[PDB]
Design an enzyme around this catalytic site. Sequence first.
Site, short mmCIF file in Angstrom:
data_model
loop_
_atom_site.label_atom_id
_atom_site.label_comp_id
_atom_site.label_asym_id
_atom_site.label_seq_id
_atom_site.Cartn_x
_atom_site.Cartn_y
_atom_site.Cartn_z
N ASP A 281 0.88 -1.18 0.00
CA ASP A 281 0.00 0.00 0.00
C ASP A 281 0.92 1.23 0.00
OD1 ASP A 281 -1.48 2.22 0.80
OD2 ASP A 281 -1.79 1.58 2.89
N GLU A 299 -3.62 4.08 -2.32
CA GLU A 299 -4.00 3.76 -0.95
C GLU A 299 -5.50 3.81 -0.71
OE1 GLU A 299 -2.57 6.02 2.69
OE2 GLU A 299 -2.45 4.00 3.53
N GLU A 300 -6.14 4.93 -1.07
CA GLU A 300 -7.55 5.11 -0.78
C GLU A 300 -8.42 4.13 -1.54
OE1 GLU A 300 -5.67 7.83 -1.94
OE2 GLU A 300 -5.76 9.34 -0.38
C1 LIG Z 1 0.50 5.78 -14.04
C2 LIG Z 1 0.30 7.23 -13.63
C3 LIG Z 1 -1.12 7.66 -13.25
C4 LIG Z 1 -1.93 6.71 -12.37
C5 LIG Z 1 -2.34 7.22 -10.97
C6 LIG Z 1 -3.46 6.38 -10.40
C7 LIG Z 1 -3.47 6.03 -8.93
C8 LIG Z 1 -3.16 4.60 -8.68
N1 LIG Z 1 -1.98 4.18 -8.78
C9 LIG Z 1 -1.80 2.85 -8.80
N2 LIG Z 1 -2.66 1.90 -8.53
C10 LIG Z 1 -1.96 0.72 -8.72
C11 LIG Z 1 -2.33 -0.63 -8.55
N3 LIG Z 1 -3.56 -1.05 -8.17
N4 LIG Z 1 -1.39 -1.56 -8.80
C12 LIG Z 1 -0.19 -1.14 -9.19
N5 LIG Z 1 0.27 0.09 -9.37
C13 LIG Z 1 -0.67 0.98 -9.12
N6 LIG Z 1 -0.56 2.36 -9.18
C14 LIG Z 1 0.65 3.11 -9.54
O1 LIG Z 1 1.18 3.70 -8.37
C15 LIG Z 1 1.70 4.99 -8.68
C16 LIG Z 1 1.69 5.81 -7.42
O2 LIG Z 1 0.35 5.92 -6.94
P1 LIG Z 1 -0.03 7.00 -5.87
O3 LIG Z 1 -1.32 6.60 -5.17
O4 LIG Z 1 -0.02 8.38 -6.42
O5 LIG Z 1 1.13 6.74 -4.80
P2 LIG Z 1 2.14 7.68 -4.01
O6 LIG Z 1 2.95 8.49 -5.04
O7 LIG Z 1 2.96 6.89 -3.06
O8 LIG Z 1 1.14 8.63 -3.24
C17 LIG Z 1 0.97 8.51 -1.81
C18 LIG Z 1 -0.19 9.38 -1.40
N7 LIG Z 1 -1.41 9.04 -2.16
C19 LIG Z 1 -2.50 8.72 -1.20
C20 LIG Z 1 -1.71 8.18 0.00
O9 LIG Z 1 -2.54 8.15 1.16
C21 LIG Z 1 -0.60 9.22 0.06
O10 LIG Z 1 -1.10 10.45 0.64
C22 LIG Z 1 0.81 5.46 -9.81
O11 LIG Z 1 1.48 6.48 -10.52
C23 LIG Z 1 0.57 4.18 -10.63
O12 LIG Z 1 1.56 4.02 -11.64
#
Ligand SMILES: CCCCCCCCNc1nc2c(N)ncnc2n1[C@@H]1O[C@H](COP(=O)(O)OP(=O)(O)OC[C@H]2[NH2+]C[C@H](O)[C@@H]2O)[C@@H](O)[C@H]1O
Length: 507
Positions: A281, A299-300
């Site tokens: 996560d 995460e959410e």
């Molecule tokens: C590819 C670029 C755009 C996509 C963004 C969509 C959000 C989901 N990302 C995601 N879901 C994934 C999944 N199912 N399995 C595998 N990989 C997944 N991802 C990838 O993870 C990257 C980072 O996601 P993000 O949620 O922005 O992570 P953090 O950069 O660590 O942000 C942390 C903060 N976000 C909310 C949390 O509580 C913190 O405050 C994304 O780019 C995407 O490639």
Amino acid sequence: DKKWLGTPIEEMRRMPRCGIRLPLLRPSANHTVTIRVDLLRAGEVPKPFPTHYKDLWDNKHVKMPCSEQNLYPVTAGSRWELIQTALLNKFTRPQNLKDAILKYNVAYSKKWDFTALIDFWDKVLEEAEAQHLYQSILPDMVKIALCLPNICTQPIPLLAAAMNHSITMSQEQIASLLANAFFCTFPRRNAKMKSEYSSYPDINFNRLFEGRSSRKPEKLKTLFCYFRRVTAAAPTGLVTFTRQSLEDFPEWERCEKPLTRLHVTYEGTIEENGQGMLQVDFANRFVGGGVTSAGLVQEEIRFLINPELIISRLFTEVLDHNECLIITGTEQYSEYTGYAETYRWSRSHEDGSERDDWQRRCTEIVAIDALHFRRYLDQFVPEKMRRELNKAYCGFLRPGVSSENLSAVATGNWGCGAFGGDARLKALIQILAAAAAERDVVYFTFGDSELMRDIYSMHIFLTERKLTVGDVYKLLLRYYNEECRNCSTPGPDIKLYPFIYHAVESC
Ligand SMILES: CCCCCCCCNc1nc2c(N)ncnc2n1[C@@H]1O[C@H](COP(=O)(O)OP(=O)(O)OC[C@H]2[NH2+]C[C@H](O)[C@@H]2O)[C@@H](O)[C@H]1O
């Protein structure tokens, strides 16, 4: 271009088949267990232990809404009696639910906006859907909420900073607590200027009801899917929440362990394609992020499709640089598409995961928060690299467990979306953390085929040349020194992977 590269996923370790034989579940100094372990039986609803409600109203335990010390200035009155009176009315319109919740949250009458709740009920739902909500789902949520003192009979310790402690509770117990959180009944968890719980995430669901974001209806659909399922038929399993604080961190430059295996793929997701694997996560230090408000990224989304994760917010203090939270047993209740503004509740999910010997679904999630980088070059500073290594390593390490009983790590672009990290650096940081923790890595690049190829090429280059964790970390320190430290422009002249290839090949 292939869909995946490296070691076949079939060759990777998965739970519960890779798992050591669970010891018998018992309460101890570092393990709270809120159910009768002697009566735990497959397909039976767990019996709470103790039999009758016991209250602790102090700085080391959750302040329960049903506590006799939960008072409100009237002369002191009983908030729990007030909650009962407010919620046992019939709802036929959304204002009724607003008015109910506000009866025992009077200080927040002007501060809490219910526009999203009102719009969901009046302007999104069809007549029959709304009727099912107010005639069946909400009244059932009220009843499990008000059952709290019969269900959650044992005081719940706060997983406070630096504690190495686990809480194992029933899914039913979690359902009752989350119903309370929905009706915003948890005391001392509301004030902007609060002290005691200022270091803890939100738990009350009031910010789910505010504003006009098109994603609130989708969040409410996902949660009501959960609430309709757990109030119609009580879930029978358990869920464990473990805070882990590590004292000793590796001396990365001197680490002689070799790299472990990698499967990397631009298709699939952590939650679908990481069954039996340690699922990462991409957390906030306040676990669950904006799940109870506007947040709707990795995460959410996980917290919504597995809502039992949300209850971690009740008792999990903000994570420090050396800590993580490991959650084992959460069940998936919904399927989804997209993210953020494209996020949609797809349909109800019937979780087919096996349960372990403690009746936990065989799903282990670790919340590790990456750093939020405002400037790209900040992440290459050695103390920031070391910080990220140690966070991932604390998330991956299972003190006293042999490597053959460790599942692969199912991860991806950790910290590289909202938190502005560089995927190629973070991937190498995770590969090194996994190696030190003696785990293989299953990396999902989430649509990026070029990133899959790049990670694979680098990992196979390093593996073939037998570079140790220390050898690779030293190369990161060289990149910082030659390309980042004295760099005045916003981006470095040469990228990290080209630099590593040139550094190794030319010596
Ligand atoms: C590819 C670029 C755009 C996509 C963004 C969509 C959000 C989901 N990302 C995601 N879901 C994934 C999944 N199912 N399995 C595998 N990989 C997944 N991802 C990838 O993870 C990257 C980072 O996601 P993000 O949620 O922005 O992570 P953090 O950069 O660590 O942000 C942390 C903060 N976000 C909310 C949390 O509580 C913190 O405050 C994304 O780019 C995407 O490639």
